Write a protein of this length. Structure first.
Lengths: 82, 121, 80, 85
RNA sequence: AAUUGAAGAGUUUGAUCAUGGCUCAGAUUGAACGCUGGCGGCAGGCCUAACACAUGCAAGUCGAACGGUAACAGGAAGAAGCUUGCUUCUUUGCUGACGAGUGGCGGACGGGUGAGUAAUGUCUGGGAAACUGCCUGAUGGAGGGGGAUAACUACUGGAAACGGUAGCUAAUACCGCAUAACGUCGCAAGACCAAAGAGGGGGACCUUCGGGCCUCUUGCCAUCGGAUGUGCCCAGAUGGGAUUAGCUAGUAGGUGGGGUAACGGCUCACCUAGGCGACGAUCCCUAGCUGGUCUGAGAGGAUGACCAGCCACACUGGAACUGAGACACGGUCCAGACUCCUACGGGAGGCAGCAGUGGGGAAUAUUGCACAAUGGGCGCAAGCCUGAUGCAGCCAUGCCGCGUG
RNA sequence: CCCGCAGAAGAAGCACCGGCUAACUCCGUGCCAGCAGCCGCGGUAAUACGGAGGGUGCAAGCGUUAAUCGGAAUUACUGGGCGUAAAGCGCACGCAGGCGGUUUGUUAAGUCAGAUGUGAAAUCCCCGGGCUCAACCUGGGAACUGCAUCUGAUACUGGCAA
C-alpha cells in the first residue's frame, strides 16, 4: 500500500525524520513519491519541531494512502486544536 | 586388457582414452581383464585432468566387453572397456570419484576405495 | 495535435512498408558546429503510396512489426 | 516442516496437479472445437463451442486463465465457426 | 543574496632566443608501508579469489478460517489424612491457550554482490496495445448441495527426501447447480461466467438448547474507477580498436493460424527479397549505468568508494511450478566441474545475508546488545519475527574540535 | 551535560635545510660508504653523504609509495602549430561530405523570446536554525547550464519560388 511514513535521515543519536509518502515495499530511506514534511525529536525553542503539508496528507488519504502510528500522532499534534 | 588396448576411464582425474602398454604380472601373460593391474599410457587427455598426454602409470581393469563369469555361470558384460588410474609406486586411485558400474571381484586389497566411491556394485 | 516527423523515403522495396530518413540539424556538444545527422525509420505504408524520393509525414504508433513503429502521410478523404 | 519453504513445496506440488487437471480439460474442449472446425461442419462446431465456453469462463473466474485468454479463445473460435458458414 | 575568477620554477647551450619533452611546488583517496601516538564528535573500513566455507542466527505469522489437544493452567460422578479440599481417576476440549496438521497472507520486500552486460542495460524525452496482491470510491450480490484429504487410527518400507497400504473427519481447502449484469463473446438475437464465513453483544418467540431472530465489526464475489508497482514501443545520448568492412534467411516485410496480461517474427505455414552498414554494421578487447565524486578559473579531464534511483546475479549451465508479482539468496526438478554422508545402494548442502574461518593480498573490523525508536511481514489487537535498523567493539582511515598549561 | 576533588599534574613526534623550496655550521668518510623528484653531490676544508648543534615547515600526526587532475596553451571548442624546430599528400580530376555572390515573396527546420510539464531526494551554492563550537544534521530558495510541447519574431542560416 501507499504509506505516509517517517524516514530517518539525521546524524548519530540526533535523528531527523522526513515525513514522506512511499510504497510500503521500499526501504526506509529509499524511494519515495513525495515529501510531506519533517519532524525533529530533539526538542528546541522553534515552532518547526514538526511541519506537515496537511493538504498533501489529505490528498493521499483520499487516494488511499495509509498513515503510520507516528504520523497519526504528529497529525494529532499539528492540527487546529494543537 | 591386452597390450595395445584403448580404454575409457571411470575416474575423473584420469582423462578420456588410455592405452595399455604392458600386461603386468606373469612372464608371457597375454590377457588380463578382470581386476588385474595394467600399465597404461595416456593417448588423449583433457586439460581438466591432472594427468597429461604421454604419461605412463598403472591402472586396474573395471569394466570389460568380455565380461566376468560368476560362480553359478552368470556373465556380466559391460559395453566398452574401462579402467581406473593408479599411481606407479603406491597403486592407489588418483581419481576422487568413480563413475559407472563396478563388479564385486574388485574387492581385494586396494580396490575397496574404488567400490566405495562407485555408485553401482 | 499529433507529433509528426517529416522526411524523404529511401526504399519502397518492402511490401506495405517504407523506410524514411529524418534529417536533424544538431549542434556538436564540443566543437559547436551545427552538423547534419540522419535517423532512418521503418514506416508502415498503406496501399504502397509513397514512391522513392517523396517527402512524407510520419506518426508514431503501436509496434506493427519488429523495427516498424510509424504510419501514413496525412489526413484521409483527400482534402483539397 | 515448520519452515515455510517446505510447506510451499507441498502446496506447489498439490496446486500443480490440480491446475494441470483443469488446464488439460479446457485444452481438450478447445481442441474439440478446433477439430470440429477442421472437419468443416458447423453444427458440431457450435455444440463444441457451447460446451467449451462455460468451462473456459469458469476457469478464468477461478484464476488460472486470467480472462483475456478466455476472450481470445472465444473470439478466435467464434470467428472460425462463422467463417465456416 | 545563490560562477566573488586563471602565479610559475629547474633542466639542451660557452652564452642567447625559440621549439620541445622530462621533473617539481597544489588538491584529492574505500589508500598501503616506515616512524610516532592523548581525548572526543561525525563519517568510512576486502579496492584482489563472483575463491572455498566450520559454527550460530538473518522469515515468519494468524486459535477472530478448521479438525482438534501434543504441552501449560482453571472444572471431579470414585473414596480419601476418618482434618474435607492442602493432592489425585475411564477422564473431557468445556474454556483460556497451543506442539504438529489443513488453510490464508507473507516467503518476489528488506539485506548482499558487480560476475555478466557497449546495449532485453542506464540517463533524458515522448507513446499505446497491458496487467496490478495488499490500500481506496461507487453499484449490486452473498441462495442451496456434494465428494475428498491432511492431521489421526492400525499395518508397514533398514533406519533415502523418508515413503507406501486400508479406514474416519473439518474448513474462509475443492467441485458442481441456481442466480447474471454498466462483465465476456457476438453485427445482433442471444449464450456464458461469482462467492465463504468468522468474531462480539443482545427484548420477544420457537427450539438442538450449540441456534433461527436483531444489531455491530470484519471477511467473501462481480464490475467500473483511483493510487501504486510492473510489462512493452520510439527518438537522442551511452569506452577503445577500420592493423575488425562488408554482416544478415526468422534474417526483412506482408497475409493467414497460434501464443502473451498486451503490440510485436513472439512462433509456424506460405508469399515477396528484402534488412543493417563508411553518420562505423559485424568482429575483438574492456565495462554495470546515473544522481553524483576528485581536480579544474572555466570548458574540460578522470572516476562511479559511501549514500539514493535503475539493471544484472545468487556453487555453474538449463528449465518450468505456485502466485498479483519469479523463471525465485536462505523455493522445487535435472544434469557436475565440489564437499559430507550407508542400511555402501540412498541421500543431504550451497555466506556474492550478519558475524566469523582458511586462502589470496600492500591492505580492510565483532562468531557483541537490543527490537527502546524508525521501517517491513502476519494479526482485529495484545503481540511474534526482523544480522533491516538503532547501537556498541576494533582501526589516527578521513574531516573537525580540544588538550599536552 | 552539570557540579565537586587532587595535582602541572597523565599526554610530542615526523620530515627537511645546495637550487627549484622556508631553513647552515662543525665532526667523520674520501667518485668509497652512500644521497637523489630534476639539475646533480662524493676522487682530504662536502651548506647535497652519516652523526651532533642550530634552524624551518607540519603537528596527533609526519614522510614515502600508488592513482587522478592541475600547472601542460604538452590534443589547443574555449585555446596550438606545419619555409628552416614535428608537420602541405609529388601533382591533378573528382563522388559523398563541408562551405557558399545579389534582390524579392513564402515557410519557420536551425536561431531568439515567453509560458507549461519534467529534469527524484541527496550533494554543490546562498540566506537562516540546531549540536558549548567545528565537522555533522537540517528549513526555504537558487541551481540542475537538459528535453518535450504551445504561442510569438523573421535579422542571419536552411527549404521553396521567381
Amino acid at each position: 500500500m501507499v504509506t505516509i511514513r517517517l524516514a530517518r535521515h539525521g546524524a548519530k543519536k540526533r535523528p531527523f525524520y522526513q515525513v514522506v509518502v512511499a510504497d510500503s515495499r521500499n526501504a526506509r530511506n529509499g524511494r519515495f513519491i513525495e515529501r510531506v514534511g519533517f519532524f525533529n525529536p530533539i526538542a528546541s525553542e522553534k515552532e518547526e519541531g514538526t511541519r506537515l503539508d496537511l493538504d498533501r496528507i489529505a490528498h493521499w488519504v483520499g487516494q488511499g494512502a495509509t498513515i503510520s502510528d507516528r504520523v497519526a500522532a504528529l497529525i494529532k499534534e499539528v492540527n487546529k486544536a494543537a | 586388457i591386452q597390450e595395445q588396448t584403448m580404454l575409457n576411464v571411470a575416474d575423473n582425474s584420469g582423462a578420456r582414452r588410455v592405452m595399455c602398454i604392458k600386461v603386468l604380472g606373469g612372464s608371457h601373460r597375454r590377457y588380463a581383464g578382470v581386476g588385474d593391474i595394467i600399465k597404461i599410457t595416456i593417448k588423449e587427455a583433457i586439460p581438466r585432468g591432472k594427468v597429461k598426454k604421454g604419461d605412463v602409470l598403472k591402472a586396474v581393469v573395471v569394466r570389460t566387453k568380455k565380461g566376468v563369469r560368476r560362480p553359478d555361470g552368470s556373465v556380466i558384460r559391460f559395453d566398452g572397456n574401462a579402467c581406473v588410474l593408479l599411481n606407479n609406486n603406491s597403486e592407489q586411485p588418483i581419481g576422487t570419484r568413480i563413475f559407472g558400474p563396478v563388479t564385486r571381484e574388485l574387492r581385494s586389497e586396494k580396490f575397496m576405495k574404488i567400490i566405495s566411491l562407485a555408485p553401482e556394485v | 495535435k499529433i507529433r509528426t516527423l517529416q522526411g524523404r523515403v529511401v526504399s519502397d522495396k518492402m511490401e506495405k512498408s517504407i523506410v524514411v530518413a529524418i534529417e536533424r540539424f544538431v549542434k556538436h556538444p564540443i566543437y559547436g558546429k551545427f552538423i547534419k545527422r540522419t535517423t532512418k525509420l521503418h514506416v508502415h505504408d498503406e496501399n504502397n503510396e509513397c514512391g522513392i524520393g517523396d517527402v512524407v509525414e510520419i506518426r508514431e504508433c503501436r509496434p506493427l512489426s519488429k523495427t516498424k513503429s510509424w504510419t501514413l502521410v496525412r489526413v484521409v478523404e483527400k482534402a483539397v | 516442516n515448520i519452515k515455510s519453504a517446505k510447506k510451499r513445496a507441498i502446496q506447489s506440488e498439490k496446486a500443480r496437479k490440480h491446475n494441470a487437471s483443469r488446464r488439460s480439460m479446457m485444452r481438450t474442449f478447445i481442441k474439440k472445437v478446433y477439430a470440429a472446425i477442421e472437419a468443416g461442419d458447423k453444427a458440431a462446431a457450435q455444440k463444441a463451442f457451447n460446451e467449451m465456453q462455460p468451462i473456459v469462463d469458469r476457469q478464468a473466474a477461478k484464476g488460472l486463465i486470467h480472462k483475456n485468454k478466455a476472450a481470445r479463445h472465444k473470439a478466435n473460435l467464434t470467428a472460425q465457426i462463422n467463417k465456416l458458414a
